Amino acid sequence: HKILHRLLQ
Amino acid sequence: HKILHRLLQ
Amino acid sequence: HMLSDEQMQIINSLVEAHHKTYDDSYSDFVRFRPPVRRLSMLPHLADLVSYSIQKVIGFAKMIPGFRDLTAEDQIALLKSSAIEIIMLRSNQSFSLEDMSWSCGGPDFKYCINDVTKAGHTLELLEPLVKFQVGLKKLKLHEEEHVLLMAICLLSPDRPGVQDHVRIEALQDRLCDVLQAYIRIQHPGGRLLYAKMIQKLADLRSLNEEHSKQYRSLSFQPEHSMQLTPLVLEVFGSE
Amino acid sequence: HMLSDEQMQIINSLVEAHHKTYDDSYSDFVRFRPPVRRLSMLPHLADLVSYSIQKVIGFAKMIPGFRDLTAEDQIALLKSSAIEIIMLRSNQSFSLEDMSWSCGGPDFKYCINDVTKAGHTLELLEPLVKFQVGLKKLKLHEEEHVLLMAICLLSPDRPGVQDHVRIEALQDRLCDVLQAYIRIQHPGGRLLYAKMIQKLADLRSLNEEHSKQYRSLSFQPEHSMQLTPLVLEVFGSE
Numbered sequence A, B: 001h002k003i004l005h006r007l008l009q
Numbered sequence C, D: 001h002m003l004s005d006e007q008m009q010i011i012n013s014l015v016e017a018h019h020k021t022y023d024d025s026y027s028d029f030v031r032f033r034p035p036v037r038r039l040s041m042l043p044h045l046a047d048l049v050s051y052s053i054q055k056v057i058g059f060a061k062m063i064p065g066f067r068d069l070t071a072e073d074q075i076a077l078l079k080s081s082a083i084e085i086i087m088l089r090s091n092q093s094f095s096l097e098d099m100s101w102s103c104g105g106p107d108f109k110y111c112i113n114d115v116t117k118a119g120h121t122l123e124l125l126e127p128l129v130k131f132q133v134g135l136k137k138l139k140l141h142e143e144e145h146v147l148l149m150a151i152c153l154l155s156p157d158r159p160g161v162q163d164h165v166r167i168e169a170l171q172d173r174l175c176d177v178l179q180a181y182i183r184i185q186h187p188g189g190r191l192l193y194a195k196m197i198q199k200l201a202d203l204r205s206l207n208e209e210h211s212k213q214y215r216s217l218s219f220q221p222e223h224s225m226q227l228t229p230l231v232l233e234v235f236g237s238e
């Protein structure tokens, strides 16, 4: 889940 | 590569 | 008989987050792949939902207590609840007069036939629309709408959650805020809380029917290539 | 001194495939996410390239002999060569007068500064533009352009290929067609074949620099979420 991690700061 | 297979008929 | 400060701060900060994450003008809809009216609407709706998932994530990070959960639970909660929060936040654009989502002129007016052209059958769209009218008839205050979205997002009964005690606690405080709010701030709301919590059970049922119909799209590479990566990650099975 | 029938049929069918896969009006560019002028251009260019990969795949399937390769080799060839074929097919829209790709009005006129706003530095765009002018100065016939694209696509020296003997054979027949074509059909072309094959070595070098700069994008989730799935699959490392 690379993208959700990033979006979750 | 699910998508290339499909596009390659 | 009177909301505490902490119960007021939870409302204040939740209302602010929704004001930051929800544009009433829908102007960013011109950055999406245009709608077309074989599944003509799928690229626009994929874009629209993908944008919405980004907004939901922004709401979530400001729900008091969410940020302090573990990254796993935050993702678990987001992954299972995203479509319910989107269905919920979409009511702000839903209109009872035309039974569509009016986010623009003829372009971003989303009839029921348009969402069919994105791969979904009436077995999802029939309950979803009726859910929207019944939610619309509640004439929720902004505080209630917001509180309901955050209560949805903090359900411990979701696949993946681990610390379902600590998010149970967060959801409990919010339910308490919503009941306090209705009791103190909403004339004639004596029955509102019960109907609202009933709407969450409706959402579960819509969520199932959506994930079933999505699974059908995502297993056909010709349609799944029209999805965005965020959509694929959030509704994917990993 | 005269092309055989089989060498004519290879030209005929290759020219037809490019006519089916390349719209000179660029009208489908209005289905892409619009260009914006933080990487403002990445969503449009991702869409543009993703569409182009679909067109390249369509060309490939009609190259005499390609369809009879194994699915592995077809993908191996497509995955390594896609950007070179896109760079190659893009010359048809390149214009020497303005040093841009003119596929529309001000919207789809792609300057060099626009591709920067999509995450690529001058170390890729400087050789790519000069490659385009030198390719443009060759004033290739349609038969040559097409033949060159198919020769690029049938390089055995690519990561993944297995039957590099049988695609070596296919590429050899095409090189023979191109030399026969230039010798018989192009006055003053006595030197053309050598310059064209020189352009393939240029493409390898552009291909490396692109894949290096792409790897940088695809490891930053904030930009890789702007890519399409096809792009992610074709330029990905799996």
Ligand SMILES: C=C1/C(=C\C=C(/CC)c2cccc(CCCCCC(O)(C(F)(F)F)C(F)(F)F)c2)C[C@@H](O)C[C@@H]1O
Pocket (backbone or CB within 6 Å): C042, C045, C046, C048, C049, C050, C052, C083, C086, C087, C089, C090, C091, C092, C093, C094, C101, C103, C110, C115, C118, C119, C120, C210, C214, C217, C227, C231, C235
């Ligand atoms: C989003 C929002 C709006 C409308 C949502 C609307 C009505 C147009 C909706 C909301 C939930 C569900 C549905 C049916 C299935 C959707 C399809 C998704 C999808 O299944 C796809 F695209 F593939 F088909 C998925 F998930 F993959 F993207 C509609 C507009 C505005 O109020 C902002 C607000 O945020």
Ligand SMILES: C=C1/C(=C\C=C(/CC)c2cccc(CCCCCC(O)(C(F)(F)F)C(F)(F)F)c2)C[C@@H](O)C[C@@H]1O
Pocket (backbone or CB within 6 Å): D042, D045, D046, D048, D049, D050, D052, D083, D086, D087, D089, D090, D091, D092, D093, D094, D101, D103, D110, D115, D118, D119, D120, D210, D214, D217, D227, D231, D235
């Ligand atoms: C495609 C075509 C055209 C122009 C191509 C042009 C000039 C605008 C191009 C061609 C190759 C290379 C480059 C630089 C890097 C691109 C960026 C890609 C990418 O790195 C991204 F988007 F992420 F940045 C990738 F691959 F991921 F998509 C430009 C227009 C028309 O002639 C049709 C024809 O087919």
